[PDB]
Design a binder for this molecule. Structure first.
Ligand SMILES: *[C@@H]1O[C@H](CO)[C@@H](O[C@@H]2O[C@H](CO)[C@@H](O)[C@H](O)[C@H]2NC(C)=O)[C@H](O)[C@H]1NC(C)=O
Ligand SMILES: *[C@@H]1O[C@H](CO)[C@@H](O)[C@H](O)[C@H]1NC(C)=O
Ligand SMILES: *[C@@H]1O[C@H](CO)[C@@H](O)[C@H](O)[C@H]1NC(C)=O
Ligand SMILES: *[C@@H]1O[C@H](CO)[C@@H](O)[C@H](O)[C@H]1NC(C)=O
Lengths: 103, 128, 106, 115, 116
């Protein structure tokens, strides 16, 4: 019944809508609008860099939804580079920040 | 020479209180030089020309070179229980895609019941 | 939402359950979610695991060709009833993909 | 609303409809009496495809957003020679609709929910 | 928490678990700078009673309390054949390790807007 206006996965906002029938009449058919955001709480500011401070402020301009990001996506891989000094040889290597989703 | 801006409006709230009919208005402004006409299609099927009444291009109140036009259409009141969205369209030479289909439905419009339900967890790091 | 397939038993002795098999995921479970809290408790899953109660009566056979996985449960008792789910990923709740119901007329 | 949020001059329409014979004199006034009525533009009467004997009209008033979003009402008037007092008028503003109550449902339980 | 009550030194652990076969390689760096191999100790793979043919290992790093209380960030990179990228990492700091405060600034605007 409910149509979907927004399915953003970066902000996990699911804007939908539905019109409910009145008490056996075509009048006062009140419309609805459901919004459901799920705040991460444990994610960093720069989601692709595990050194930036924690994410405190959350700004939601609903107009744009219907680029800084908030959450990860169940269908993508995040990677980075770190120095390793094995055998006194500083070396950069690609590290799967979000493993199990890079297979 | 500017992009012809277009808009659409739904029937008035007090209009849906006599149970005779309803009117939907598609406003076309700009389109310099004045070259537009509107065809009101529904479900991809053009409606009869006797329903929509386009009149003429008219200069804007302050018109350096801009113009505007208005076109309405008449429907039945009892048909709005399903909407059908009654699409509008415009055509002009100063458009990259020369079509700007515009359509609205009972569902689209002003909401009267906001139901925000935000939730806070620590396992929401990934959006499932 | 995803389908709500329902199965029955017609007296105990054997039962068979089928759920869709997603791609690019290594974990597959059939948690029963029959708890007052609601938190689903994984019954039989890959990545090596099993239920303290459900042992020797539970097995999983994944078939990528049919995009399905098969779980066979021998016999039947009063405890193993109610509803069951299926899914993938690394979060038993929020990762489900079906809601199946198990019942026996015995 | 798409016109308001785009930072463009809002246009209000007065849909005079159903007057016979074809004679009407629409006017737009603010704070009591009209100011430079040429500011707006109106259209001549035209037929309908329904019922024998009817006419419709139009009117457009252009106003900036910093004024429309802040006060005044811009009432419309219709001067037809069949009205009880020969004058009839309607009015709109931002709050001409419905209260549109909210139903905020904030949740701070990390254990159950998130669905 | 009890260890921090003493305000002496803090120990951060890193529990690798359930990898077959053995020979995992673990290293520690602080805010993008690798640390000396002598500042931490790594265990050796040991059998897993619950899981047949599975191994696990430990690793601990010790630093002063002041360093832990200056938002300094530490990470535990690991290397194994099964790892798709062959390297994966986890990271924690004062704010993320079992915090005592959840400071939040939820802010939304133009809720009405134009949505299609
Ligand atoms: C967030 O982190 C990313 C990754 O470090 C930053 O973008 C990288 O910048 C470096 C140079 O400083 C480049 O070598 C990388 O190619 C960039 N990454 C990508 C994906 O292009 C980004 O600037 C950081 N954001 C902020 C606000 O600091
Ligand atoms: C408001 O949202 C909640 C959460 O989704 C839902 O349970 C409730 O039924 C909604 N109310 C209406 C009137 O839709
Ligand atoms: C308010 O929200 C609750 C759910 O949180 C829902 O049951 C109720 O119908 C809502 N009120 C209205 C007027 O829809
Ligand atoms: C908590 O948030 C406020 C702003 O809402 C900020 O002033 C303060 O620094 C925050 N607390 C910490 C410990 O950063």
């Amino acid at each position: 019944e409910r149509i979907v206006l927004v399915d953003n996965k970066c902000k996990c906002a699911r804007i939908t809508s539905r019109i409910i029938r009145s008490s056996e009449d075509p009048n006062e058919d009140i419309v609805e609008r459901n919004i459901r955001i799920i705040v991460p709480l444990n994610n960093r500011e720069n989601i692709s860099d595990p050194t930036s401070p924690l994410r405190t402020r959350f700004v939601y301009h609903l107009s744009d939804l219907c680029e800084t990001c908030y959450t990860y996506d169940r269908n993508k891989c995040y990677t980075a580079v770190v120095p390793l000094v094995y055998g006194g040889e500083t070396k950069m290597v690609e590290t799967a920040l979000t493993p199990d989703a890079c297979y | 020479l500017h992009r012809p801006d277009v808009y659409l409006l739904p029937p008035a709230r007090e209009q849906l209180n006599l149970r005779e009919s309803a009117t939907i208005t598609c406003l076309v402004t700009g389109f310099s030089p004045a070259d537009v006409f509107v065809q009101w299609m529904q479900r991809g099927q053009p409606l009869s020309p006797e329903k929509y009444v386009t009149s003429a291009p008219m200069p804007e109140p302050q018109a350096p070179g801009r113009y505007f036009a208005h076109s309405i259409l008449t429907v039945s009141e009892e048909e709005w229980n399903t909407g059908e969205t009654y699409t509008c369209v415009v055509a002009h030479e100063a458009l990259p895609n020369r079509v700007t289909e515009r359509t609205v439905d009972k569902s689209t419009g002003k909401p009267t019941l906001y139901n925000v339900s935000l939730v806070m967890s620590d396992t929401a790091g990934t959006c499932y | 939402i995803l389908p709500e397939v329902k199965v029955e038993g017609e007296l105990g002795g054997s039962v068979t359950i089928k759920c869709p098999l997603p791609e690019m995921h290594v974990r597959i479970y059939l948690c029963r979610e029959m708890a007052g809290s609601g938190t689903c408790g994984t019954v039989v899953s890959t990545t090596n695991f099993i239920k303290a109660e459900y042992k020797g009566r539970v097995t999983l056979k994944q078939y990528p060709r049919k995009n399905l996985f098969l779980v066979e449960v021998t016999q039947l008792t009063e405890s193993d009833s109610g509803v069951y789910a299926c899914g993938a990923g690394m979060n038993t709740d929020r990762g489900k993909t079906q809601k199946v119901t198990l019942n026996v007329h015995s």
